[PDB]
Design an enzyme around this catalytic site. Sequence first.
Site, PDB file in Angstrom:
ATOM      1  N   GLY A 257     114.658 -23.577 -12.401  1.00  0.00           N
ATOM      2  CA  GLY A 257     114.991 -24.661 -13.305  1.00  0.00           C
ATOM      3  C   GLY A 257     113.622 -24.797 -14.291  1.00  0.00           C
ATOM      4  O   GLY A 257     113.543 -25.341 -15.272  1.00  0.00           O
ATOM      5  N   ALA A 258     113.070 -25.085 -13.478  1.00  0.00           N
ATOM      6  CA  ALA A 258     111.388 -25.013 -13.778  1.00  0.00           C
ATOM      7  C   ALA A 258     110.271 -24.414 -12.937  1.00  0.00           C
ATOM      8  O   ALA A 258     110.708 -24.083 -11.567  1.00  0.00           O
ATOM      9  CB  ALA A 258     111.354 -26.446 -14.671  1.00  0.00           C
ATOM     10  N   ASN A 261     103.297 -24.028 -12.492  1.00  0.00           N
ATOM     11  CA  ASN A 261     102.085 -22.820 -12.283  1.00  0.00           C
ATOM     12  C   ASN A 261     101.451 -24.380 -12.799  1.00  0.00           C
ATOM     13  O   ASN A 261     101.193 -25.024 -13.835  1.00  0.00           O
ATOM     14  CB  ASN A 261     102.517 -22.421 -13.191  1.00  0.00           C
ATOM     15  CG  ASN A 261     103.727 -21.296 -13.402  1.00  0.00           C
ATOM     16  OD1 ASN A 261     103.556 -20.287 -12.157  1.00  0.00           O
ATOM     17  ND2 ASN A 261     104.105 -21.164 -14.320  1.00  0.00           N
ATOM     18  N   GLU A 294     108.368 -31.470 -11.598  1.00  0.00           N
ATOM     19  CA  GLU A 294     107.374 -29.847 -11.555  1.00  0.00           C
ATOM     20  C   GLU A 294     105.982 -30.555 -11.754  1.00  0.00           C
ATOM     21  O   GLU A 294     104.871 -30.394 -10.868  1.00  0.00           O
ATOM     22  CB  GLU A 294     107.272 -29.657 -12.896  1.00  0.00           C
ATOM     23  CG  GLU A 294     108.440 -28.962 -12.546  1.00  0.00           C
ATOM     24  CD  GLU A 294     109.268 -28.110 -11.736  1.00  0.00           C
ATOM     25  OE1 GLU A 294     108.098 -27.573 -11.154  1.00  0.00           O
ATOM     26  OE2 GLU A 294     110.492 -27.738 -11.466  1.00  0.00           O
ATOM     27  N   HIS A 297     104.578 -32.059  -7.763  1.00  0.00           N
ATOM     28  CA  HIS A 297     104.195 -30.611  -7.205  1.00  0.00           C
ATOM     29  C   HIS A 297     102.499 -30.096  -7.152  1.00  0.00           C
ATOM     30  O   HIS A 297     102.128 -29.753  -6.683  1.00  0.00           O
ATOM     31  CB  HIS A 297     104.895 -29.342  -7.605  1.00  0.00           C
ATOM     32  CG  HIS A 297     106.064 -28.710  -6.871  1.00  0.00           C
ATOM     33  ND1 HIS A 297     106.127 -28.782  -5.711  1.00  0.00           N
ATOM     34  CD2 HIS A 297     107.169 -28.608  -7.147  1.00  0.00           C
ATOM     35  CE1 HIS A 297     107.749 -28.388  -5.380  1.00  0.00           C
ATOM     36  NE2 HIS A 297     108.192 -28.205  -6.932  1.00  0.00           N
TER      37      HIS A 297
HETATM   38  N1  LIG Z   1     108.727 -24.300  -7.140  1.00  0.00           N
HETATM   39  C1  LIG Z   1     110.066 -24.735  -8.392  1.00  0.00           C
HETATM   40  C2  LIG Z   1     111.158 -23.480  -8.700  1.00  0.00           C
HETATM   41  C3  LIG Z   1     110.236 -22.239  -8.499  1.00  0.00           C
HETATM   42  C4  LIG Z   1     111.894 -21.009  -8.247  1.00  0.00           C
HETATM   43  O1  LIG Z   1     112.837 -21.611  -7.326  1.00  0.00           O
HETATM   44  O2  LIG Z   1     111.040 -19.729  -7.940  1.00  0.00           O
HETATM   45  C5  LIG Z   1     110.366 -25.930  -8.479  1.00  0.00           C
HETATM   46  O3  LIG Z   1     111.162 -25.715  -7.426  1.00  0.00           O
HETATM   47  O4  LIG Z   1     110.022 -26.620  -8.737  1.00  0.00           O
HETATM   48 ZN   LIG Z   2     110.033 -27.609  -6.551  1.00  0.00          ZN
END
Ligand SMILES: N[C@@H](CCC(=O)O)C(=O)O
Ligand SMILES: [Zn+2]
EC number: 3.4.11.2
Length: 866
Positions: A257-258, A261, A294, A297
């Site tokens: 999805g997204a 970073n 995102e 995060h």
């Molecule tokens: N860490 C990302 C997903 C990236 C991945 O699937 O590698 C998120 O859950 O928003």
């Molecule tokens: Zn996530």
Amino acid sequence: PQAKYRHDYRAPDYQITDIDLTFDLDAQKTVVTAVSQAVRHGASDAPLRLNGEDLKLVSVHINDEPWTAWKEEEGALVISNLPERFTLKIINEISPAANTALEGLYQSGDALCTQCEAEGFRHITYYLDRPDVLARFTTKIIADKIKYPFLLSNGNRVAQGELENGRHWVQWQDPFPKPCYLFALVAGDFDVLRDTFTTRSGREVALELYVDRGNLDRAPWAMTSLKNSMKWDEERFGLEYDLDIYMIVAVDFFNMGAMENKGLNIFNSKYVLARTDTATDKDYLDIERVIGHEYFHNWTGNRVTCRDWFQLSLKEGLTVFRDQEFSSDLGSRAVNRINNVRTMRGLQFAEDASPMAHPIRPDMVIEMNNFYTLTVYEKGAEVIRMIHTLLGEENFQKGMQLYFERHDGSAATCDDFVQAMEDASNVDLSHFRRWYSQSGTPIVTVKDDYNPETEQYTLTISQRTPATPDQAEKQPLHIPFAIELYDNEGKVIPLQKGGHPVNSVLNVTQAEQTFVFDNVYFQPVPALLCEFSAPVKLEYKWSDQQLTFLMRHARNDFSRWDAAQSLLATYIKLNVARHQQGQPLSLPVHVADAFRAVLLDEKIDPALAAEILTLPSVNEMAELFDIIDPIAIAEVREALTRTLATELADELLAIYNANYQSEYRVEHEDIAKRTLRNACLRFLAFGETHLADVLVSKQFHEANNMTDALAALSAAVAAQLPCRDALMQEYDDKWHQNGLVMDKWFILQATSPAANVLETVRGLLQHRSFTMSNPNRIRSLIGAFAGSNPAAFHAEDGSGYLFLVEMLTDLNSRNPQVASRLIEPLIRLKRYDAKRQEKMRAALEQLKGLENLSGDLYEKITKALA
Ligand SMILES: N[C@@H](CCC(=O)O)C(=O)O
Ligand SMILES: [Zn+2]
Ligand SMILES: N[C@@H](CCC(=O)O)C(=O)O
Ligand code: NA
Ligand code: NA
Ligand code: NA
Ligand code: NA
Ligand code: NA
Ligand code: NA
Ligand code: NA
Ligand code: NA
Ligand code: NA
Ligand code: NA
């Protein structure tokens, strides 16, 4: 390929503190220079073991000395005889254009972009590709100016220059140390939507959203949602953004999805691009949720990261919880909660009963990309929500504050988080921690007794979790079990015992216990497991009248919906058994009357009404059964729809008409009315054919927004109305150049009830808007077929399985992460009858024999065939 185990974790022998990267970028051959400052923590004789996949090594220097004491092994560069502190310089080459797996540095149309989570940075250079190694990055990018006028990486621009031969360069620095999974690079030509947000303490943040040329008309809602996310995190959690620029880049080719970073989020364009003629209400709300996710995060994942990948739920459960809370606070809390509950019971519960079952903190992993799961995400969030239920908001926030105060700037563990919550609140979470280590869904059985001589009500509550394929041993959990007791007028009976109030969240911690309430002046109707207070199956012997009473009287909207679900479940099960014996649908008149009452109740929120009038999906239906009959479930869902459409016809039309809106707005009251109106339309489409055809065709042609247009089209397909082919062709002719809009249409083709659906799906592999190289198209055609049309996928001739084997045979080589998502319906074989199991096993055995079987598929296939 070899499993890794959580109990084998050990601190790294070497740390990296600072890394300076240079990219000489070109799609066919990119040259990466990486200069890392390293420090030995382990024994003097420990070599440095760097991860690396598909790299061409050019040179290795240590403090500028060409190094001779190294070797390459499978997946690694092993460097011996090192000083305690040193500069490592690696030069290597990679090839973005050959990267069909979309992991590391790859091409998305004419852009170059990265995806490094979980272990993709090792596809860019030799590194300590593990998230407990945090380093300060500086990134210089050199490229062709005409092809790549924008050169982006994490943080701020610190240097820029022009070179001969039409090249230019930009250097970026991010002051926060990060694990390499949070590295990003983007190079391309974009339109850019620019805005600003000023934080509560006055920090001005430049917001920049990069989209393909020509898509700025579809950017403002994502920008609006980003600003909403930033304001909400400040209001609810006290959290501000910590950098000067927030960049989002929308790319068409992306496996998930997204991605969060730091300072440079990279998004699947599905979760960015919207305008009223291209995107439905649900797309708007999904963009909002993913944008928010995102952003959240930034704290829960970036400022505090994961010690190791087994701790993935530390950031994913918590961030999903935050995105649900965001959605819920801005929109309808009841509708959000209902939908999250539908996901849990209908999709996550099926995973927890599958060969791939795992605890939210897994113990064993072969390929870490296989553990971005409903369990880790959605069950993870239910676990965080249980903490919130146990602590209350104020204590929960104190915990959040202690978590950040202890762990800001570091990697942490799930156990660290629970400990902060425990220490800040003074609530004991020792037993609660078992939710992190035990897989499977608990079954909570409740019996009741009302004693009119003493005016006492007794609940006897028991729990068990069945063994799962990964764990033979199960123990009782700390289950927060929320109740409410209703008197004959629909009022809440105060909970109390021995002349003191009793908290309405019961602590169900044993295999069996009793709770006794006093001063219960009337035999109660209970609302049990209120707001799905724990992620469990509830076994209680409801009468139909108890459930219709809750539908009319329960205080929380969720409980009214949930009572409706329990009323329907009985009759779904009845009617599936009837279907298997060749008998038609049977439904008591008082059941139909309960749904009629919902349609005509002026006092019910239309958002709630719409959900009550949205039948459980075939996936949620499947969870009611030990052995799934997908054909019966699909035909019963249809027959039930037809029965309700006939019984409630006049009321359905009346409500359909009353909720007409001439203006389109992306506002929650308007969305709710429209969701109700379209829920009525769905039943009407399954009523008398002539009226259905007229209503559906007219809505499609007169709609001023994609939500209304698609609801009509989808009803035309589902009810096989006369107008279907003409409307489907109009949509193709209008929208074929637009992949995201065509995804909706591919889903409808894949999920059609028509007898020739597989033939049509195979034929769509050649459609002008389809390509095997694009994960969104694969998902929308192939994935929707296998996962959302179980009746066709599980056709008795086995054709669905054979089709999936053929697609997987291509995808195993092209894009294994996508392959592994798509295999999921085949690994559920033990839920089906013996003749289907036999065919599904033969399909799996064919895949197990592929040349160059990916680790992604190997893990799932071996567990399934066990
Ligand atoms: N860490 C990302 C997903 C990236 C991945 O699937 O590698 C998120 O859950 O928003
Ligand atoms: Zn996530
Ligand atoms: N699609 C119909 C019911 C038939 C089925 O779902 O198998 C509906 O969504 O209203
Ligand atoms: Na470090
Ligand atoms: Na640096
Ligand atoms: Na709200
Ligand atoms: Na891999
Ligand atoms: Na404790
Ligand atoms: Na009873
Ligand atoms: Na009872
Ligand atoms: Na229910
Ligand atoms: Na339906
Ligand atoms: Na094509």
